[PDB]
Amino acid sequence: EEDASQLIFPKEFETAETLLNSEVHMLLEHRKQQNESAEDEQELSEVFMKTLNYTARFSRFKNRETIASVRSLLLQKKLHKFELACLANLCPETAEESKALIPSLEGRFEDEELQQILDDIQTKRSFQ
C-alpha cells in the first residue's frame, strides 16, 4: 500500500517532517548532553546508542551552519520532503545515478539542472 519509489505513504506519514542524519545526530547529541545533567536519571536505552553511531557514521556535514545552508538552498527548490532526505543522505555523485535510485525523480527537473544540484551538495560536503 505504501512505496517509497512511488511516493505513496499512509495518512500518518503525510505531515511528518524528514530529518537528515546530520540533523538527527545533533538532536541525539542534545539528548546525550541532557543525559549527563540531572544525575541518577534513567540511562539511555541501547537503541539510542545504535542510532547515534549510525547517524554519526553517515553524517555528511560536520558543521551546523552547513546543514542549515543546505536545507535553505533545498527549500528554494520545489522538492518533496521525503525526496529531500534521500537527496541529502545518499548524495549521488551524478544526475543519472540519482534518477536511477529514485524513479519518481525522473521528469521533476531538467537533467542538466539535476546534475548542478548534486554538485552544489558536494561543495558544501566536507571531506575528511
Binding site: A16, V47, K50
Partner: protein
Amino acid sequence: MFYHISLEHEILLHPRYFGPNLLNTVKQKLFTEVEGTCTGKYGFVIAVTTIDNIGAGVIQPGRGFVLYPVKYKAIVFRPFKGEVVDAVVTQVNKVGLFTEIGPMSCFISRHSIPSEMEFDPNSNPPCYKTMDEDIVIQQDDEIRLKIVGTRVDKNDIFAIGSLMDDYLGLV
C-alpha cells in the same frame, strides 16, 4: 527512513506516584515505556524528542489508576518495501547474511544474494567473494540492500535485503 512524528501514548500512574512531582513521574515513566518497544504501525522508536502535552488524568473507576494520555514527539525508522537503505553486516553465514540498520535488523537469504557470490568457508572470517574478487562482502561493512518486504512479530520488525538490483552491495 528516519521520520520525526508525534505519537499518542497513555500512562497509567499508580496512586503512590501522586502528589508533588506527579507530572515529572508521568514524563519520566513515558520514556521508559516507549523506549525499547516497537510497533508495526510506527516501527522502532529511538527516543522522545519532547512531550507536546500531557492530557487530563482520567481516574479509572474502581481500578484506582489514573490514565494520562501523552502527546510526545519521537523519531522512528520504518522499513519501506522497495526501498534502498545502507546496512551494516553483523554476521556472515552460508544460509544467509545478517545485517543491522540501527535498531532494525535485516536478514538476507542466500537466494536473494547474487549468483556469482559464493560463501568462503575456507577463509577464517566468513565472507562472500567473486571469482575475480572484484567485489567482496564481509562482516562490518557498509552495503546497500533493497527492502523486499516488511514483517512484524512480537513487537519486532525485520526485513529482507536483496542485492539483485543494480547500484547495490558494497560500493
